[PDB]
Amino acid sequence: GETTDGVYRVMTRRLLGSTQVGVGVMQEGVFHTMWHVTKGAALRSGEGRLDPYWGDVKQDLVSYCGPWKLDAAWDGLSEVQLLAVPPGERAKNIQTLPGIFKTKDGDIGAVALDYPAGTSGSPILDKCGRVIGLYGNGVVIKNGSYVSAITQGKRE
Amino acid sequence: DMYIERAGDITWEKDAEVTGNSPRLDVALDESGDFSLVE
Ligand SMILES: CC1(C)C(=O)Nc2ccc(C(=O)Nc3ccc4c(c3)CNC4)cc21
């Protein structure tokens, strides 16, 4: 099916009507998304089929048709863009300065933007347009707002 | 059965809407891939 690079919606017809469960990135022939969006299930792209290739529940990432290709990283200083693809709404870039998730295994950038759960898998970009991570896995702070980690995979 | 639909190009947009704060949070990551606030 469609293998052109770009951001894509992950849809399902199992529920009422057509429901958007997430978003993903097509790059170098590989579809990248978050694990909790597909649960590792096969994907359809028109008549074609995309089979899972690599995945990990702890990282919350999954790749289709090949290994993880995205390896750009947040520089720890600059503003980034969340290319949000919300359910039923047009792709729209949102600029923000990320915060930090301090963990026992190092620090990770984090974006404090609130979107429907179906926006999970939307890419976070640097000024060069490179995907530095995906949106959709983080925490809910005291006032009820959402903070997502800038989740990046490893390129082998 | 899940399917994919193209939603656009991945490009940086000059003069995009600038919003959101930068909080420094102490967090923990469990085996299920779920984050939690460390207190
Ligand atoms: C609605 C709200 C708060 C929001 O504003 N944006 C998002 C984005 C993602 C989720 C989300 O639930 N993500 C998730 C679900 C399941 C699992 C993981 C992550 C990683 N382990 C299993 C929620 C939100």
Cβ B11 vs Cβ A19: under 8 Å: no
A46/A102 same-domain check: no
Beta pairing, strands B2-8 & A43-45: parallel
| Residue A38 in domain | yes
- The verdict on B22 touching A (C-beta cutoff 8 Å) is yes
Whole-angstrom CA distances from A58 to A33, A40, A137, B34 are 14, 13, 10, 8
CATH (domain of A120): 2.40.10.10
- The verdict on A132 touching B (C-beta cutoff 8 Å) is no
Terminal alpha carbon distance of chain B: 41
Number of domains in chain A: 2
Helix (H, G, I), strand (E, B) or coil at A118: helix
Q: In what helix (H) or strand (E) does residue A35 lie, and over which residues does it extend?
A: helix A35-38
Q: Where are the beta strands (DSSP E) in A13-91?
A: 19-27, 30-34, 43-45, 48-50, 52-56, 61-64, 80-84
DSSP state of A63: E
Tell me which residue range forms the domain holding A111.
Answer: 80-149
| Residue A122 in domain | yes
Cβ A95 vs Cβ B18: under 8 Å: yes
A106/A48 same-domain check: no
A86/A56 same-domain check: no
Q: In what helix (H) or strand (E) does residue A147 lie, and over which residues does it extend?
A: strand A146-149
Mutate to test the interface with B, among A139, A140, A141, A143 (most CBs of B within 10 A): A139
CATH (domain of A39): 2.40.10.120
A86/A138 same-domain check: yes
Query: Of B6, B19, B21, B11, which is closest to residue A126 (Cα–Cα)?
Result: B11
Domain boundary among A64, A99, A114: A64
Cβ A68 vs Cβ A61: under 8 Å: yes
Query: Of A23, A51, A25, which is closest to residue A37 (Cα–Cα)?
Result: A23
- Which residue has 């959101």 as its token pair? B20
- Exp. method: X-ray
Cα nearest neighbour of B38 on chain A: A103
How far is Cα A51 from Cα A138, in angstroms, rounded to an integer?
27
- Whether A151 is in the pocket of ligand 1, judged by its Cβ within 6 Å, is no
